Design a protein around this ligand. Structure first.
Ligand SMILES: [Ca+2]
Ligand code: NA
Length: 432
Protein backbone atom coordinates (compact mmCIF):
# COMPACT_ATOMS: atom_id res chain seq x y z
CA UNK A 1 0.00 0.00 0.00
CA UNK A 2 3.31 1.59 -0.74
CA UNK A 3 2.53 5.10 0.10
CA UNK A 4 0.65 5.06 3.40
CA UNK A 5 -3.13 5.38 3.09
CA UNK A 6 -4.85 8.19 4.97
CA UNK A 7 -8.61 8.63 5.18
CA UNK A 8 -10.00 12.10 4.50
CA UNK A 9 -12.23 13.76 7.11
CA UNK A 10 -15.39 15.67 6.17
CA UNK A 11 -18.42 17.53 7.47
CA UNK A 12 -21.30 17.23 5.00
CA UNK A 13 -21.38 21.03 4.95
CA UNK A 14 -17.75 21.37 3.82
CA UNK A 15 -17.56 23.42 0.57
CA UNK A 16 -16.95 21.97 -2.88
CA UNK A 17 -13.22 22.25 -3.61
CA UNK A 18 -13.25 20.67 -7.05
CA UNK A 19 -10.93 17.99 -5.70
CA UNK A 20 -12.29 15.95 -2.78
CA UNK A 21 -15.80 17.40 -2.60
CA UNK A 22 -17.95 17.68 -5.71
CA UNK A 23 -21.50 17.36 -7.02
CA UNK A 24 -21.95 14.26 -9.18
CA UNK A 25 -24.49 12.78 -11.57
CA UNK A 26 -24.09 9.00 -11.82
CA UNK A 27 -27.14 8.66 -14.07
CA UNK A 28 -28.09 5.65 -11.93
CA UNK A 29 -29.86 6.90 -8.80
CA UNK A 30 -33.59 7.03 -9.53
CA UNK A 31 -34.10 8.85 -6.23
CA UNK A 32 -31.90 11.73 -7.38
CA UNK A 33 -33.49 14.67 -9.18
CA UNK A 34 -30.36 16.82 -9.13
CA UNK A 35 -26.58 16.35 -8.67
CA UNK A 36 -25.49 14.58 -5.48
CA UNK A 37 -22.78 15.91 -3.17
CA UNK A 38 -19.89 13.45 -3.02
CA UNK A 39 -16.74 13.12 -0.91
CA UNK A 40 -13.44 11.40 -1.75
CA UNK A 41 -12.59 8.99 1.07
CA UNK A 42 -9.22 8.26 -0.50
CA UNK A 43 -7.94 7.78 -4.02
CA UNK A 44 -10.70 6.53 -6.31
CA UNK A 45 -13.12 5.61 -3.50
CA UNK A 46 -15.97 8.10 -3.10
CA UNK A 47 -19.01 8.35 -0.87
CA UNK A 48 -22.39 9.93 -1.61
CA UNK A 49 -24.36 9.89 1.68
CA UNK A 50 -27.78 9.61 -0.01
CA UNK A 51 -30.32 6.81 -0.30
CA UNK A 52 -29.91 4.97 -3.61
CA UNK A 53 -32.36 3.15 -5.88
CA UNK A 54 -32.50 1.48 -9.29
CA UNK A 55 -36.29 1.18 -9.38
CA UNK A 56 -38.38 3.50 -11.55
CA UNK A 57 -40.82 5.51 -9.42
CA UNK A 58 -38.84 4.54 -6.29
CA UNK A 59 -40.56 4.37 -2.91
CA UNK A 60 -38.67 3.94 0.36
CA UNK A 61 -41.80 3.26 2.41
CA UNK A 62 -42.40 -0.11 4.05
CA UNK A 63 -44.01 -2.46 1.48
CA UNK A 64 -47.70 -3.28 2.09
CA UNK A 65 -47.26 -6.73 0.56
CA UNK A 66 -44.81 -9.07 2.26
CA UNK A 67 -42.42 -10.75 -0.17
CA UNK A 68 -39.76 -11.97 2.30
CA UNK A 69 -38.84 -14.27 4.18
CA UNK A 70 -35.77 -12.04 3.84
CA UNK A 71 -35.67 -9.65 6.80
CA UNK A 72 -36.33 -6.01 5.98
CA UNK A 73 -36.14 -2.63 7.69
CA UNK A 74 -37.77 0.41 6.06
CA UNK A 75 -37.62 4.13 6.85
CA UNK A 76 -38.40 6.61 4.05
CA UNK A 77 -36.86 9.39 6.14
CA UNK A 78 -33.47 7.79 6.87
CA UNK A 79 -30.79 10.04 5.34
CA UNK A 80 -33.38 12.58 4.21
CA UNK A 81 -31.87 15.46 6.18
CA UNK A 82 -28.38 16.96 5.87
CA UNK A 83 -27.92 16.20 9.56
CA UNK A 84 -28.52 12.53 8.77
CA UNK A 85 -26.08 12.62 5.86
CA UNK A 86 -23.40 14.25 8.00
CA UNK A 87 -23.62 11.44 10.55
CA UNK A 88 -23.68 8.75 7.84
CA UNK A 89 -20.68 10.36 6.13
CA UNK A 90 -18.72 10.41 9.39
CA UNK A 91 -19.66 6.81 10.16
CA UNK A 92 -18.32 5.57 6.82
CA UNK A 93 -15.15 7.59 7.34
CA UNK A 94 -14.64 6.20 10.84
CA UNK A 95 -15.18 2.64 9.61
CA UNK A 96 -12.55 3.12 6.91
CA UNK A 97 -10.08 4.35 9.53
CA UNK A 98 -10.72 1.22 11.59
CA UNK A 99 -10.38 -0.97 8.51
CA UNK A 100 -7.11 0.87 7.79
CA UNK A 101 -5.81 0.08 11.30
CA UNK A 102 -4.81 -3.46 10.25
CA UNK A 103 -2.40 -4.40 7.45
CA UNK A 104 -4.93 -6.43 5.47
CA UNK A 105 -7.43 -3.57 5.62
CA UNK A 106 -4.86 -1.03 4.54
CA UNK A 107 -4.02 -3.22 1.52
CA UNK A 108 -7.72 -3.70 0.75
CA UNK A 109 -8.23 0.07 0.71
CA UNK A 110 -4.99 0.67 -1.19
CA UNK A 111 -6.04 -1.69 -3.99
CA UNK A 112 -9.63 -0.46 -4.30
CA UNK A 113 -8.47 3.17 -4.25
CA UNK A 114 -5.52 2.72 -6.63
CA UNK A 115 -6.18 0.04 -9.25
CA UNK A 116 -8.75 0.86 -11.90
CA UNK A 117 -11.16 -1.03 -14.15
CA UNK A 118 -9.65 -1.68 -17.58
CA UNK A 119 -11.07 1.14 -19.72
CA UNK A 120 -13.47 -0.88 -21.84
CA UNK A 121 -15.91 -3.76 -22.09
CA UNK A 122 -16.67 -6.69 -24.38
CA UNK A 123 -17.60 -4.31 -27.20
CA UNK A 124 -14.56 -2.04 -26.94
CA UNK A 125 -12.29 -2.35 -30.00
CA UNK A 126 -9.11 -4.30 -29.25
CA UNK A 127 -6.89 -1.26 -29.89
CA UNK A 128 -8.93 1.17 -27.79
CA UNK A 129 -8.92 2.47 -24.20
CA UNK A 130 -12.42 3.79 -23.45
CA UNK A 131 -12.60 5.81 -20.25
CA UNK A 132 -16.31 6.52 -20.75
CA UNK A 133 -17.50 2.93 -21.25
CA UNK A 134 -20.83 1.98 -19.64
CA UNK A 135 -21.07 3.81 -16.30
CA UNK A 136 -17.37 4.09 -15.45
CA UNK A 137 -17.28 7.87 -15.99
CA UNK A 138 -19.40 10.01 -13.67
CA UNK A 139 -20.38 13.59 -14.54
CA UNK A 140 -19.15 16.44 -12.36
CA UNK A 141 -21.60 19.34 -12.26
CA UNK A 142 -21.86 22.80 -10.75
CA UNK A 143 -24.84 25.10 -10.33
CA UNK A 144 -25.05 27.92 -12.88
CA UNK A 145 -27.99 30.20 -12.23
CA UNK A 146 -30.91 27.93 -11.36
CA UNK A 147 -29.51 24.97 -13.29
CA UNK A 148 -26.69 22.44 -13.11
CA UNK A 149 -24.14 22.21 -15.90
CA UNK A 150 -21.53 19.53 -16.56
CA UNK A 151 -17.97 20.79 -16.11
CA UNK A 152 -16.16 17.49 -16.41
CA UNK A 153 -16.13 13.93 -15.12
CA UNK A 154 -14.31 11.55 -12.79
CA UNK A 155 -13.78 7.78 -12.80
CA UNK A 156 -14.43 6.41 -9.32
CA UNK A 157 -13.57 2.74 -8.83
CA UNK A 158 -15.99 2.46 -5.92
CA UNK A 159 -18.85 4.69 -4.78
CA UNK A 160 -20.36 4.06 -1.37
CA UNK A 161 -23.93 5.29 -0.94
CA UNK A 162 -26.62 5.00 1.70
CA UNK A 163 -29.02 2.01 1.62
CA UNK A 164 -31.53 1.20 -1.08
CA UNK A 165 -35.17 0.40 -0.15
CA UNK A 166 -34.31 -2.31 2.38
CA UNK A 167 -31.97 -0.64 4.87
CA UNK A 168 -30.64 -3.96 6.19
CA UNK A 169 -29.84 -5.45 2.79
CA UNK A 170 -26.42 -4.10 1.72
CA UNK A 171 -26.02 -4.28 -2.06
CA UNK A 172 -22.97 -3.97 -4.31
CA UNK A 173 -23.51 -3.73 -8.06
CA UNK A 174 -21.84 -2.81 -11.33
CA UNK A 175 -23.84 -1.45 -14.26
CA UNK A 176 -23.89 -1.81 -18.04
CA UNK A 177 -25.65 -0.56 -21.15
CA UNK A 178 -28.45 -2.80 -22.46
CA UNK A 179 -26.51 -4.28 -25.39
CA UNK A 180 -23.35 -5.08 -23.40
CA UNK A 181 -22.34 -7.84 -20.98
CA UNK A 182 -20.97 -7.30 -17.46
CA UNK A 183 -17.34 -6.19 -17.72
CA UNK A 184 -16.95 -7.02 -14.03
CA UNK A 185 -17.29 -10.72 -14.92
CA UNK A 186 -14.90 -10.48 -17.88
CA UNK A 187 -11.49 -9.43 -16.59
CA UNK A 188 -12.02 -5.73 -17.38
CA UNK A 189 -13.68 -4.91 -14.09
CA UNK A 190 -15.99 -1.93 -13.67
CA UNK A 191 -17.15 0.81 -11.31
CA UNK A 192 -18.93 -0.58 -8.25
CA UNK A 193 -21.62 1.09 -6.16
CA UNK A 194 -22.08 -0.16 -2.60
CA UNK A 195 -25.38 0.87 -0.98
CA UNK A 196 -25.20 0.21 2.74
CA UNK A 197 -25.54 1.42 6.33
CA UNK A 198 -23.09 -0.44 8.61
CA UNK A 199 -24.62 0.88 11.84
CA UNK A 200 -27.63 -1.38 11.20
CA UNK A 201 -26.00 -4.54 12.51
CA UNK A 202 -27.10 -8.10 11.86
CA UNK A 203 -27.30 -10.30 14.99
CA UNK A 204 -26.53 -14.01 15.40
CA UNK A 205 -25.75 -16.75 17.93
CA UNK A 206 -23.97 -19.24 15.65
CA UNK A 207 -20.54 -17.59 15.91
CA UNK A 208 -16.90 -18.33 15.06
CA UNK A 209 -15.56 -17.78 18.57
CA UNK A 210 -16.51 -20.10 21.41
CA UNK A 211 -17.13 -18.05 24.55
CA UNK A 212 -17.92 -21.06 26.73
CA UNK A 213 -21.72 -21.01 26.48
CA UNK A 214 -22.17 -24.19 24.43
CA UNK A 215 -23.73 -26.25 27.23
CA UNK A 216 -25.89 -23.43 28.51
CA UNK A 217 -27.70 -20.59 26.73
CA UNK A 218 -25.77 -18.93 23.91
CA UNK A 219 -25.66 -15.15 23.75
CA UNK A 220 -26.65 -13.16 20.68
CA UNK A 221 -23.86 -11.04 19.20
CA UNK A 222 -23.85 -8.21 16.68
CA UNK A 223 -21.66 -8.05 13.59
CA UNK A 224 -18.97 -5.38 13.85
CA UNK A 225 -19.88 -2.67 11.28
CA UNK A 226 -16.47 -2.93 9.61
CA UNK A 227 -17.14 -6.55 8.62
CA UNK A 228 -20.53 -5.65 7.17
CA UNK A 229 -18.77 -3.01 5.06
CA UNK A 230 -15.69 -5.13 4.29
CA UNK A 231 -17.99 -7.93 3.08
CA UNK A 232 -19.19 -5.59 0.34
CA UNK A 233 -15.67 -4.28 -0.30
CA UNK A 234 -14.85 -7.89 -1.15
CA UNK A 235 -17.53 -7.79 -3.85
CA UNK A 236 -15.99 -4.53 -5.04
CA UNK A 237 -12.59 -6.25 -5.19
CA UNK A 238 -14.01 -9.03 -7.38
CA UNK A 239 -15.69 -6.41 -9.56
CA UNK A 240 -12.57 -4.26 -9.86
CA UNK A 241 -10.35 -7.17 -10.90
CA UNK A 242 -12.98 -8.55 -13.29
CA UNK A 243 -13.49 -11.89 -11.53
CA UNK A 244 -17.08 -11.47 -10.36
CA UNK A 245 -19.12 -14.67 -10.65
CA UNK A 246 -22.60 -14.16 -12.20
CA UNK A 247 -25.36 -14.14 -9.59
CA UNK A 248 -27.14 -17.01 -11.36
CA UNK A 249 -24.38 -19.29 -10.03
CA UNK A 250 -25.92 -20.53 -6.79
CA UNK A 251 -26.41 -23.45 -4.42
CA UNK A 252 -29.87 -24.11 -2.96
CA UNK A 253 -29.69 -23.84 0.82
CA UNK A 254 -31.77 -22.85 3.84
CA UNK A 255 -31.63 -20.33 6.66
CA UNK A 256 -33.97 -18.60 9.08
CA UNK A 257 -34.61 -15.34 10.88
CA UNK A 258 -36.91 -13.78 13.47
CA UNK A 259 -40.11 -13.93 11.39
CA UNK A 260 -39.57 -17.13 9.39
CA UNK A 261 -38.32 -20.55 10.45
CA UNK A 262 -35.98 -22.39 8.06
CA UNK A 263 -36.76 -21.35 4.47
CA UNK A 264 -35.14 -21.85 1.02
CA UNK A 265 -32.58 -19.47 -0.43
CA UNK A 266 -30.39 -19.54 -3.54
CA UNK A 267 -26.95 -18.85 -2.08
CA UNK A 268 -24.83 -16.99 -4.63
CA UNK A 269 -21.27 -18.19 -5.19
CA UNK A 270 -20.36 -14.49 -5.20
CA UNK A 271 -21.48 -14.25 -1.55
CA UNK A 272 -19.72 -17.49 -0.67
CA UNK A 273 -16.43 -15.99 -1.83
CA UNK A 274 -17.05 -12.63 -0.15
CA UNK A 275 -17.58 -14.54 3.12
CA UNK A 276 -14.79 -17.08 2.66
CA UNK A 277 -13.61 -19.77 5.04
CA UNK A 278 -14.62 -23.49 4.80
CA UNK A 279 -17.90 -22.37 3.21
CA UNK A 280 -15.98 -22.02 -0.03
CA UNK A 281 -16.07 -25.82 -0.23
CA UNK A 282 -19.83 -25.64 -0.82
CA UNK A 283 -18.90 -24.72 -4.38
CA UNK A 284 -17.97 -27.88 -6.32
CA UNK A 285 -14.20 -28.00 -6.78
CA UNK A 286 -14.64 -28.47 -10.53
CA UNK A 287 -16.81 -25.33 -10.61
CA UNK A 288 -14.32 -23.29 -8.58
CA UNK A 289 -11.61 -24.30 -11.05
CA UNK A 290 -13.89 -23.42 -13.98
CA UNK A 291 -14.45 -19.84 -12.81
CA UNK A 292 -10.75 -19.40 -12.12
CA UNK A 293 -9.78 -20.67 -15.59
CA UNK A 294 -12.47 -18.48 -17.14
CA UNK A 295 -10.92 -15.49 -15.36
CA UNK A 296 -7.46 -16.44 -16.61
CA UNK A 297 -8.76 -16.53 -20.19
CA UNK A 298 -10.28 -13.08 -19.76
CA UNK A 299 -6.92 -11.94 -18.40
CA UNK A 300 -5.07 -13.32 -21.44
CA UNK A 301 -7.52 -11.40 -23.59
CA UNK A 302 -6.69 -8.24 -21.57
CA UNK A 303 -2.94 -8.71 -22.08
CA UNK A 304 -3.67 -9.03 -25.80
CA UNK A 305 -5.54 -5.73 -25.71
CA UNK A 306 -2.60 -4.07 -23.95
CA UNK A 307 -0.29 -5.14 -26.77
CA UNK A 308 -2.66 -3.50 -29.25
CA UNK A 309 -3.71 -0.10 -27.87
CA UNK A 310 -3.37 2.67 -30.46
CA UNK A 311 -6.33 4.90 -29.66
CA UNK A 312 -8.26 6.23 -26.65
CA UNK A 313 -11.64 7.80 -25.89
CA UNK A 314 -11.88 10.63 -25.29
CA UNK A 315 -8.97 11.69 -27.52
CA UNK A 316 -7.37 13.68 -24.69
CA UNK A 317 -6.26 10.31 -23.31
CA UNK A 318 -4.26 9.32 -26.42
CA UNK A 319 -1.14 10.98 -25.03
CA UNK A 320 -1.45 8.92 -21.83
CA UNK A 321 -1.89 5.46 -23.37
CA UNK A 322 1.55 4.39 -22.19
CA UNK A 323 0.87 5.53 -18.61
CA UNK A 324 -2.37 3.57 -18.38
CA UNK A 325 -0.88 0.54 -20.09
CA UNK A 326 1.69 0.51 -17.28
CA UNK A 327 -0.94 0.97 -14.55
CA UNK A 328 -3.02 -1.90 -15.91
CA UNK A 329 0.06 -4.12 -16.24
CA UNK A 330 0.72 -3.58 -12.53
CA UNK A 331 -2.94 -4.19 -11.64
CA UNK A 332 -3.13 -7.63 -13.28
CA UNK A 333 0.49 -8.41 -12.40
CA UNK A 334 1.30 -9.24 -16.00
CA UNK A 335 4.87 -9.73 -17.19
CA UNK A 336 6.68 -7.63 -19.78
CA UNK A 337 8.99 -9.55 -22.10
CA UNK A 338 12.35 -8.07 -23.08
CA UNK A 339 10.62 -7.51 -26.42
CA UNK A 340 8.08 -5.33 -24.63
CA UNK A 341 5.22 -7.76 -25.19
CA UNK A 342 2.78 -8.17 -22.30
CA UNK A 343 2.14 -11.75 -21.21
CA UNK A 344 0.27 -13.55 -18.44
CA UNK A 345 2.28 -15.51 -15.88
CA UNK A 346 0.11 -18.33 -14.51
CA UNK A 347 1.99 -18.57 -11.21
CA UNK A 348 1.36 -14.87 -10.61
CA UNK A 349 -2.27 -15.19 -11.66
CA UNK A 350 -2.94 -18.10 -9.32
CA UNK A 351 -1.44 -16.15 -6.45
CA UNK A 352 -3.53 -13.05 -7.22
CA UNK A 353 -6.75 -15.01 -7.75
CA UNK A 354 -6.23 -16.78 -4.44
CA UNK A 355 -5.68 -13.46 -2.65
CA UNK A 356 -8.86 -11.97 -4.13
CA UNK A 357 -11.07 -14.97 -3.35
CA UNK A 358 -9.63 -16.58 -0.22
CA UNK A 359 -7.51 -14.06 1.69
CA UNK A 360 -9.61 -10.90 1.30
CA UNK A 361 -12.65 -12.53 2.90
CA UNK A 362 -14.99 -11.64 5.77
CA UNK A 363 -14.10 -14.90 7.55
CA UNK A 364 -10.40 -13.98 7.49
CA UNK A 365 -11.07 -10.38 8.62
CA UNK A 366 -12.96 -11.64 11.68
CA UNK A 367 -9.82 -13.46 12.82
CA UNK A 368 -7.42 -10.66 11.88
CA UNK A 369 -9.39 -7.87 13.58
CA UNK A 370 -10.08 -10.19 16.51
CA UNK A 371 -13.84 -9.65 16.62
CA UNK A 372 -16.74 -12.04 17.17
CA UNK A 373 -18.62 -12.83 13.94
CA UNK A 374 -21.14 -15.18 12.35
CA UNK A 375 -19.67 -18.64 11.79
CA UNK A 376 -21.25 -18.94 8.35
CA UNK A 377 -22.80 -16.49 5.90
CA UNK A 378 -26.20 -18.11 6.44
CA UNK A 379 -26.05 -18.02 10.25
CA UNK A 380 -29.59 -17.55 11.54
CA UNK A 381 -30.25 -13.90 12.37
CA UNK A 382 -32.24 -12.16 15.08
CA UNK A 383 -33.47 -8.60 15.53
CA UNK A 384 -30.95 -6.11 14.07
CA UNK A 385 -29.31 -3.70 16.52
CA UNK A 386 -27.68 -0.30 16.16
CA UNK A 387 -25.51 2.05 18.21
CA UNK A 388 -23.86 5.46 18.19
CA UNK A 389 -20.60 4.26 16.66
CA UNK A 390 -19.25 7.82 16.38
CA UNK A 391 -19.08 7.91 20.19
CA UNK A 392 -15.61 6.64 21.14
CA UNK A 393 -17.01 5.43 24.45
CA UNK A 394 -19.18 3.03 22.47
CA UNK A 395 -17.06 2.15 19.43
CA UNK A 396 -13.47 3.13 18.66
CA UNK A 397 -10.97 2.57 15.85
CA UNK A 398 -8.70 0.22 17.78
CA UNK A 399 -11.16 -2.15 19.46
CA UNK A 400 -14.58 -1.42 18.01
CA UNK A 401 -17.21 -2.24 20.65
CA UNK A 402 -14.79 -4.34 22.71
CA UNK A 403 -13.30 -1.41 24.63
CA UNK A 404 -11.00 -2.28 27.59
CA UNK A 405 -11.91 0.99 29.29
CA UNK A 406 -15.57 -0.05 29.30
CA UNK A 407 -14.50 -3.49 30.53
CA UNK A 408 -16.02 -4.96 27.36
CA UNK A 409 -12.75 -6.41 26.06
CA UNK A 410 -13.22 -9.89 27.50
CA UNK A 411 -14.83 -12.59 25.36
CA UNK A 412 -16.11 -10.01 22.87
CA UNK A 413 -18.56 -8.62 25.43
CA UNK A 414 -18.86 -5.34 23.56
CA UNK A 415 -20.62 -7.30 20.81
CA UNK A 416 -22.73 -9.30 23.28
CA UNK A 417 -26.29 -7.94 23.23
CA UNK A 418 -26.89 -9.03 26.83
CA UNK A 419 -23.70 -7.39 28.12
CA UNK A 420 -23.48 -4.10 26.19
CA UNK A 421 -26.28 -1.57 26.87
CA UNK A 422 -24.91 0.64 24.09
CA UNK A 423 -26.41 -1.85 21.62
CA UNK A 424 -30.12 -1.28 21.02
CA UNK A 425 -32.63 -3.13 18.85
CA UNK A 426 -33.78 -1.18 15.80
CA UNK A 427 -37.28 0.29 15.70
CA UNK A 428 -39.67 -2.70 15.52
CA UNK A 429 -42.20 -0.41 13.83
CA UNK A 430 -40.07 -0.40 10.69
CA UNK A 431 -39.32 -4.14 10.52
CA UNK A 432 -40.90 -6.45 7.94
CA1 LIG B 1 -20.33 8.77 -18.23
NA1 NA C 1 -26.15 -8.01 -0.94
Amino acid sequence: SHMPITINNFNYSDPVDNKNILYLDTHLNTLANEPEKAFRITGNIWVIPDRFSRNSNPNLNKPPRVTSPKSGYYDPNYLSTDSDKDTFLKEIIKLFKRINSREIGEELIYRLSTDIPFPGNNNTPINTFDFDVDFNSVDVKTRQGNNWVKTGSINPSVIITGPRENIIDPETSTFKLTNNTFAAQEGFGALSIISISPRFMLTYSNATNDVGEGRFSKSEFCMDPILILMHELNHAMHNLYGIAIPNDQTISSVTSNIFYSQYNVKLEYAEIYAFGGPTIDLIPKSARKYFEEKALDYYRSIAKRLNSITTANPSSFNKYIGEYKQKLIRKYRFVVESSGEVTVNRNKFVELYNELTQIFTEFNYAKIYNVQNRKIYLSNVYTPVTANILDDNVYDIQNGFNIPKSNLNVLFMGQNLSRNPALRKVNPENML
